[PDB]
Symmetry: C4
Amino acid sequence: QNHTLILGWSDKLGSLLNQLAIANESLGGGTIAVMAERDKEDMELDIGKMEFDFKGTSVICRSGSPLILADLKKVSVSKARTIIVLAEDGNADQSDARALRTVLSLTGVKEGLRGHIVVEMSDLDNEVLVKLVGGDLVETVVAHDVIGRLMIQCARQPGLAQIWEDILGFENCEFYIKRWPQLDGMLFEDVLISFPAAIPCGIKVASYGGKIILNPDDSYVLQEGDEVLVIAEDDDTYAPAPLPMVRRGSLPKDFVYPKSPERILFCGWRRDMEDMITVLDASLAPDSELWMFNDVPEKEREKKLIDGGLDISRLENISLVNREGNAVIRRHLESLPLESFDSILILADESVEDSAIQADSRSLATLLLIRDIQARRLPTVIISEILDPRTKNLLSMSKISDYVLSNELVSMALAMVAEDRQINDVLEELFAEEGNEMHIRQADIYLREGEEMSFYEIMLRARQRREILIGYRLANAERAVINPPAKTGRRKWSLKDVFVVITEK
Amino acid sequence: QNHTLILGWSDKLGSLLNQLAIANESLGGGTIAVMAERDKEDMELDIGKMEFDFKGTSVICRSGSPLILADLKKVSVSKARTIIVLAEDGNADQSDARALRTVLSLTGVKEGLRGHIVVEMSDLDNEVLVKLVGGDLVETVVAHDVIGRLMIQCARQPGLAQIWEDILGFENCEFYIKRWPQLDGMLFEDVLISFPAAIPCGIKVASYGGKIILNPDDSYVLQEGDEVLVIAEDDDTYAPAPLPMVRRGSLPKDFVYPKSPERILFCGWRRDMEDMITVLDASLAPDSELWMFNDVPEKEREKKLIDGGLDISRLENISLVNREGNAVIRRHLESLPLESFDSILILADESVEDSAIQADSRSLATLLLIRDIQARRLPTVIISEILDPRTKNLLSMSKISDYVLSNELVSMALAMVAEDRQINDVLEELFAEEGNEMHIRQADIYLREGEEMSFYEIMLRARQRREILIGYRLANAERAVINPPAKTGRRKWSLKDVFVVITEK
Amino acid sequence: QNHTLILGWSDKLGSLLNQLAIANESLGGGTIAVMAERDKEDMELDIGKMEFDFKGTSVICRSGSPLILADLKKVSVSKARTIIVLAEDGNADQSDARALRTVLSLTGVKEGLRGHIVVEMSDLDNEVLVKLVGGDLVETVVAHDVIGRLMIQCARQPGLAQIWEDILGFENCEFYIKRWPQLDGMLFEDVLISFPAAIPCGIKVASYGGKIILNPDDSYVLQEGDEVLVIAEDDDTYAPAPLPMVRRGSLPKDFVYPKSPERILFCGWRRDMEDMITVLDASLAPDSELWMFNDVPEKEREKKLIDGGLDISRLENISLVNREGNAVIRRHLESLPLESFDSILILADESVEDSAIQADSRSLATLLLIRDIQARRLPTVIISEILDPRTKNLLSMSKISDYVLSNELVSMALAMVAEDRQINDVLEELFAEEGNEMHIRQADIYLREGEEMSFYEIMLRARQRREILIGYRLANAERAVINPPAKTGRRKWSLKDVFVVITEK
Amino acid sequence: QNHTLILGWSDKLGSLLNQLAIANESLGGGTIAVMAERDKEDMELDIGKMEFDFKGTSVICRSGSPLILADLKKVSVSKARTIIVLAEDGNADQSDARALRTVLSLTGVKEGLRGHIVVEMSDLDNEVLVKLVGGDLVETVVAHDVIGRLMIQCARQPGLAQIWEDILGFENCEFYIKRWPQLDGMLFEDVLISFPAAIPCGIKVASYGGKIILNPDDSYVLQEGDEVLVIAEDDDTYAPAPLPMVRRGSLPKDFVYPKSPERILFCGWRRDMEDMITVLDASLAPDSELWMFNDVPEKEREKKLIDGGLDISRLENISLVNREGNAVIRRHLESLPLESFDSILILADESVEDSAIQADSRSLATLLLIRDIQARRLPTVIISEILDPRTKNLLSMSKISDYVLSNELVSMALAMVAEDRQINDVLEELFAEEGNEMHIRQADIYLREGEEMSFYEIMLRARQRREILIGYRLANAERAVINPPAKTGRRKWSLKDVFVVITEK
Ligand SMILES: [Ca+2]
Ligand SMILES: [Ca+2]
Ligand SMILES: [Ca+2]
Ligand SMILES: [Ca+2]
Ligand SMILES: [Ca+2]
Ligand SMILES: [Ca+2]
Ligand SMILES: [Ca+2]
Ligand SMILES: [Ca+2]
Ligand SMILES: [Ca+2]
Ligand SMILES: [Ca+2]
Ligand SMILES: [Ca+2]
Ligand SMILES: [Ca+2]
Ligand SMILES: [Mg+2]
Ligand SMILES: [Mg+2]
Ligand SMILES: [Mg+2]
Ligand SMILES: [Mg+2]
Ligand code: NA
Ligand code: NA
Ligand code: NA
Ligand code: NA
Ligand code: NA
Ligand code: NA
Ligand code: NA
Ligand code: NA
């Protein structure tokens, strides 16, 4: 049957269905079964009111428990190509307890499983046990942790928010892995310029057991069994072609500039916030500052952090500044040096996160107050976490939409890993402080003002600093272009254009 | 279709339906659609048991969510003349979060909206964001704040309670705005006496973009496009006629008397009570006193007030007296100087307001205790907030009814703004400490004992102190008369009669 | 229609239905309508499973709200002979808030009411307001307060528990009021011996507006319009007959003995316990002691009591001893001088009373522990409050049943007042510390050992100390006999027999 | 009808049904009726999805309350051979309050009961009252207390977990009591070797009123009316046969070795944990240590223990070590000397036990952390309580299953006592610190290396130290064998084999 099976119901279900409909469109549609502990007719009513285009995909609803074998047989569990275990809205530990029981149930199916299991985990501290009992069958996506990592990346580089939304979801372009036997024996530097409609980003190396190497050496020779990781519009839109003519040349300003210290504000005590502090300490330049404004009394913050595994005495790049107060109280916020922050993250506080409507209401209240306080005392990225994707969609015609990062990104990550389990490791590396990551780079590293050259020519210059050039944003364009369709044609570039690369630190 | 659409269900729904039925009666009835997340047959059952006269208006019920476009299409959202977003019973922040999502949903309707959106807001701190995203489509009515303002006005002038109930609801007379081209070129002083069945109160000034000027200058000349604001019995009961014969004369006692200080008691810590203290400080004579009797420890009251934006060190007219105690405990209440207060407001405490039945039970318990304590220690307006309009209606044949102000006034305000969005600014001014307000004035300012004159003659005398005379209450009458039908006939007035005016401070 | 209408559903409903079925049996049955906010078919199912004999009474169920006039019309509210407003299980203030709204609704019925309204009140502090708005239509029975008073009476006189159960319910004999014109002009002392099958206890005095005088003067002459209060088996079982021959004689030992001090234990902090302490202080001999064992810290008990209106510095007969502890913890209980108490009351603690199953579980746990502690440290009335009548009935074949007093007594009181509203004042007096009350008296006051005399002869001796003799308990009988059928026959009495009287203090 | 009647519904129902199906299989099936306060069709749906073999037993579902006689008649309460009162999931006191009311209801059935009542009690402190009112009809199984006792036994002797699971459930072998008149007059030492397919363990002694004597004297002569207690595969698989030929011989090493002190860790504050500490103090060698790691502040632990009846100053064999911390926080756990414990019990904490899914999630989190901490600091039985049997079953293909003891054992105990009420006393003795218990013993007490002998010959040697030999575990076998089928055949034993005995201390 090779359908997608979704176990559960949550605020993320509609956005996940939308992603899978987009992924299936190139096939003419596919089949999705949803099984939840709800009345089947109510499920069908809700699905029938969803406002996106199903693009030929059929959605079937069944009522039942993932712990009951007779219920799993109702949705042909052993023939699904992927099984997605959706987290329950509300308390993270309760959702993760259900996830563990569900994975154990699925591993007990005696006919076996045709596909893999994608588990939406709500708390990092519960991931190891799920991975232990799920073995080779399971991929975990820790929703809470991924969102924290993306918020930090987008706070540090404004403009990555749009890029990450584009790449993590199936609209526009995204990562695909495919085997191309006709490229066996070619150097990676030539593979890079072999696809009119794709940008190679890595190689699945057969001699390493299928490990994906992002940003490999230009001198790597593709071997039998290797596969290519690309960014492309869809799984079927790209193919290798004869090598184009690409002039070679040197980087004008191949410089590493001293990184300046950053001052970041976190509003709210997020569950497991020590994990975000760890990521930030590994990401910022020395002498940076993290301010934490929240209602936890200062004298007890250290215990929370040390109990979460963070030794603040051994932070390398950041100093911590603690301020106590209520993030929806104007008087408390205005005591902060709001104008001095390079970025401000408004986080879902652990005291209210179990209710998405309450958490999101507080986050938007804080956003409005920070903006209004600053406007009123006239003579900085602000990013606000939104837990319900519906609220993000409802904000989409407002200016507010530019200031929010939502759990829709979790639905996108789940759909990516459902469609190819191997992409989970690629995303993990790009979300991690180690290895490769995405960066937005000024044009004067790569070219001179008005220089006439092709995207491929810039790409080959970028290889001289070990970067994969994946896109650009033109000086007065609203949106970056990833995997630009016109790669061989020459244009006149501006020093105000910017380039999007995958790069090591 | 031009129907009224109500989104939601609450304790206020019946009283709102009643108001709209009264407003529609002059048309022979209209149509109201109610959509809520309830079983349609249960909604219909409840509507069919409501005890007021529908007066030809038809009520249609549908089950659905205001965030779901297919549900909005079921109630012809794009053809409604007004959409009313009713607050949810219970927690104010949760209700306001729903309100914001609903306004965003309505603004997303791609066919557009024929009418305006009236949003019942539960907390003033959430109003700005709703106004920002709703733009030109939205009128907000902040129920909690309006009730606080009305309680203060009625505590300061006993007898305004009946007047405000009469004017804010569609029974008796109320505000209407209409264009009268035949009055172009006339002075406002002549417009004032041009309507046998109405009292002009202001002008919608076309050259100010349609801003309504309450109580304009007698010398203002009506221009093309201007409209007249009147108080009248219904939208169609009044029209201009030839100018009547009105004797002119002077005010006998056009004096401004020194205002005496007032001592006011607030029982209970109302949510956002600092907003009421602000209004009171701007309303009372110097050297006045506000006593706050409630269970919040004295040492922490200042923080609550400063966090709500109130700087008590810069109050101009009132001193604050703090007493700690439980407002349903006789022993605590009897320590207060109950006999010395000019007025006592029994407020819904923020600790119980999320349950209307609990809050109203405490308010009535306090009312009875205050009266009984005073009666028992024999050898003052008391106003009690009631959150459920049903309880106010059930009290209507009891003496208790004279001591209660209820959320029925919110239903009336919502219906007024639903019927003409421009009235929201008029009500805002009359509820505000700035600009014009209603006052009850002694007769000896305007006439001598037994003087024989017409209502119009008194009105023209009142213009000499920049007042609009809107009604009277005769010396031994139970009720004031607003917009009295007999305006040209002479009667013999008593110095014990009183006059109702709109006036600046 | 003249039916009984019950508004509500609670744990007391079955026992109330049983009482009304017993009261109606002499008519051949009657009709009871029950209206509650429940599914009608579920109500009917529950009624059809009740295990007592309906004795010809028909029970009709309807679904609806007592605040909705259309629902009240469904149960013919204006034709009912009595309307009983049953308290809701759980929180007392919420139940009383519903009661107030229901009384207001009933007073608004424009066709008027044929009968009276009996309101089950849960908290004494809410009674005055209900009485104020209900006027002449309402009788209140404050369930919580009545049970406290009965527990004190039964703790002080073991054997009154069975007597009160017999008299307050319709099994056996109970109070009836009826007019007997043929007794006009007779002295009360002769009325007393005029009814073979009843005992006159008082007179409804027409010249006092129908006030019932319990235990009147023997010389009172019945006037036209007066009615007789009797104890009898049923409303129709008794009638006056020619005066019997009754020998007169003197009391052998008409002595008042010095009352000895009592030591009483209250286990648990009962809601409004100050009301019980007040009753006890007025009931006990000087130098008595009340021990209060409960978990409220000693330092804060005084505030609870003074806030409830009790001035402990002005207690007349009791001293208070405070002990802190948990009444289900053996170690805490065994620190008490359990063997030294004249009686122990195990009260439903205010911390758990909102759940009858939890409260009753704690009360029975305490009962078992007190008995077991005493038995284990070998080399006193114990009375336990039970909130659910079903639990009392389930205990009825156990020895435990002798140690429990339950809310079934509330159902009995409600049925008594439903059947004749005038009985509420009689019960109030007998439950009150003022006026008349029931007492169990030793035989040697009235007769000598082996004296051969009739019940009537003893009754006339008892009149010489202003007592109404209503029954006896023979030396080795399990049960007292009230209104004994054989009143003229002589028997040989024992000084070990006891007599039941109504008497002033 | 002689069916089994189960009153209630809980997480244990499926495992109880499975046990009863196994017990009934030898009859070809039987009948089980389940009555709960649930929709009958939902009950039937759930039963129809259970995944074990019903083995010919029919399950009938009815909706109803055990307190309602009409409902009890629907399931033929008076003809059932056993009635099982299943505890409610969640709060123990509420479940036990229901149990008491249900037992009272059953004792009120006027047709009487054919069988006995098995009551699942959740808290030991509530057992005495249930036993008092249930009299001769009731057997109580205190689930919480039994699980604590089994966890201690299995922590002290690894390998008893599998043995107890085998013997307490109906798979494999278990205890049976039956009368064998042909054995009257035989000595117990000969009865012991009379059953090819069973091991006699005790005698039901008719002259003691039917008291079961476990491990009687070899010289006891069976009398008329006595019955034999055996371990056998099923009730019908065993019978006496002529005495086999059994060589006699002496024990090689009949030594009592000095018992070494043990160090035990309890993680979590279990409800009524003092009861486990009492059992442990009576079970361990002198100078043993109990460490209690949990979040209760040290200064208040003593009160909890003394209020539960434990005098820590008079412990005989253990010292208590108190550590404060959170059992799911790695940093707190790693401060413990984890490597030094002879056994670690992870207990369901009283703060979360009312939710089985939360409690079990914490227990598994602690298990994983303890194992991972130890593995990570490289250059001991661990037993975890699981409250939901479904979770234990879901873990059954994981290694984790070896580390869990679950409430499935409660279902097994309930089924054992349902099938023969007399087994409750046998289990009580084996679970008690007094009398006989099961022990795993080294082979060199009984035989020499390579000695060729039969199981019966070893059994008769074991009688010389007053032990009943019930099974063995061979040196490299995964599982012990209880009641081995091949008892007369000789094999060559290893000093690495172990023997399972019933023995006094
Ligand atoms: Ca595709
Ligand atoms: Ca965590
Ligand atoms: Ca795409
Ligand atoms: Ca109208
Ligand atoms: Ca506010
Ligand atoms: Ca009107
Ligand atoms: Ca009768
Ligand atoms: Ca009270
Ligand atoms: Ca009777
Ligand atoms: Ca069997
Ligand atoms: Ca306990
Ligand atoms: Ca077996
Ligand atoms: Mg962690
Ligand atoms: Mg504010
Ligand atoms: Mg009181
Ligand atoms: Mg105990
Ligand atoms: Na994409
Ligand atoms: Na990375
Ligand atoms: Na009006
Ligand atoms: Na104003
Ligand atoms: Na009676
Ligand atoms: Na009395
Ligand atoms: Na077994
Ligand atoms: Na034992």
